[PDB]
């Protein structure tokens, strides 16, 4: 009668800042919007941007760890893709020019791993190009898939075609997401809903005859992304899974910093993606003996490679964040820490105070070290083991 979900887990990757290839823009925005939509459908979501091949492999391993018998598993990828000899390939940021299958992740490999975990659903939304990488010599010779009638593909374009994004100087959006976002929340069967998305996508003028949605499905059960989650977890195995999820979306506590000079510095943290965190420094209290003072954040772990142009900015938008000034507490100094999947170490930075005393020219510098542990996805220890 009613199809049920043991859990609903999603892994969303958005690559933009390619090292050897044209950088993209819509992946950030699309990822942000899919997460919010997928959360409304009660999904355990993992949002990640600009992953390298190694990094990409670990996100799949963390995602696989969250899938068990009956769990609805969804994968969304927005970035560079190629299709060779019936295999789809997602291209990581670190990819060389020219690249091969070795340099890339094969979707079919991810699918097999999911089937090994007895998942109820296997949805794949590949928002990438699907042309031949003429430079790819290697043909993976992959093992046959087990017939499980729960596999669903939402290809943004068709084989040998391109998926497009509108790069309008402001936000920038992806074409697949423009038609998907308005229909995702519907209680239709996943296949039926994807096909209704395909119709509205044909009505697109910008892409007509260049990009069309391609649905491939084996699904033989009225399963949908709206299907309810087996009420009371109460199972020991179900409890381990909720801990493992919670382990990745832990944000540092908004601390207050007291300085030897009697100055108070409020330190706030915001979440943008599992990979992205925003710090803000507000000067909450200062003694009468000091009137001039600016608080600034420095000495970040070199693993993170934090550009100075993305740190200590008057507004969050100046750091590159998708989050806007109405979402983030007003008047602080905002700093964007993307690439947390690069943190092997514990997060330690210095909150540096440059100040001045009444009636003196000299500029005083009070540096205070801050250890915020492993925020968000850093806490998963993706670099763990030998």
């Amino acid at each position: 009668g009613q199809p049920l979900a043991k859990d609903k887990v999603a892994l969303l990757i958005g690559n933009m800042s390619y090292w050897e290839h044209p950088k993209l823009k819509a992946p950030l925005v699309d990822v942000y919007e899919l997460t919010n939509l997928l959360r409304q459908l009660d999904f355990k979501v993992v949002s990640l941007l600009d992953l390298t091949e190694y990094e990409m492999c670990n996100a799949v391993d963390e995602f696989l760890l969250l899938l068990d018998k009956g769990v609805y598993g969804l994968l969304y990828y927005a970035g560079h893709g190629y299709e060779n000899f019936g295999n789809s390939f997602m291209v990581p940021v670190d990819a060389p020019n020219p690249y091969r299958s070795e340099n890339c992740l094969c979707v079919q490999n991810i699918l097999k791993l999911m089937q090994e975990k007895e998942t109820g659903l296997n949805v794949f939304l590949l928002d990438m190009c699907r042309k031949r990488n003429d430079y790819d010599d290697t043909i993976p010779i992959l093992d046959a898939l087990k017939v499980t009638a729960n596999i669903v593909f939402g290809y943004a374009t068709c084989q040998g075609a391109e998926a497009f994004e509108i790069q309008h100087s402001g936000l920038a959006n992806g074409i697949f997401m423009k038609f998907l976002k308005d229909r995702l929340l519907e209680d239709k069967k996943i296949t039926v809903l994807l096909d209704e998305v395909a119709e509205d996508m044909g009505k697109c003028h910008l892409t007509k005859g260049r990009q069309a949605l391609e649905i491939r499905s084996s699904l033989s059960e009225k399963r949908a992304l709206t299907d309810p989650v087996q009420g009371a977890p109460c199972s020991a195995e179900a409890l381990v899974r909720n801990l493992q999820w919670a382990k990745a979306h832990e944000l540092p506590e908004s601390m207050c910093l007291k300085f030897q000079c009697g100055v108070h510095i409020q330190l706030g943290f915001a979440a943008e993606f599992s990979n992205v965190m925003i710090i803000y420094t507000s000067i909450v209290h200062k003694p009468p003996e000091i009137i001039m003072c600016d608080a600034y954040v420095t000495d970040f772990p070199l693993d993170l490679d934090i550009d100075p142009k993305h740190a200590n900015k008057g507004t969050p938008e100046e750091t590159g964040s998708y989050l806007v000034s109405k979402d983030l507490p007003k008047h602080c100094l905002y700093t964007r820490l993307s690439s947390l999947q690069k943190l092997k170490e514990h997060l330690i930075f210095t909150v540096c105070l440059s100040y001045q005393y009444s009636g003196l020219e000299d500029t005083v510098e009070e540096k205070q070290e801050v250890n915020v542990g492993k925020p968000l996805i850093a806490k998963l220890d993706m670099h763990r083991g030998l």
């Binding site: 044209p22 893709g81 928002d127 190009c129 497009f164 994004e165 509108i166």
Partner: peptide, 4 residues
Amino acid sequence: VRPR
């Protein structure tokens, strides 16, 4: 409108 550019490709991916």
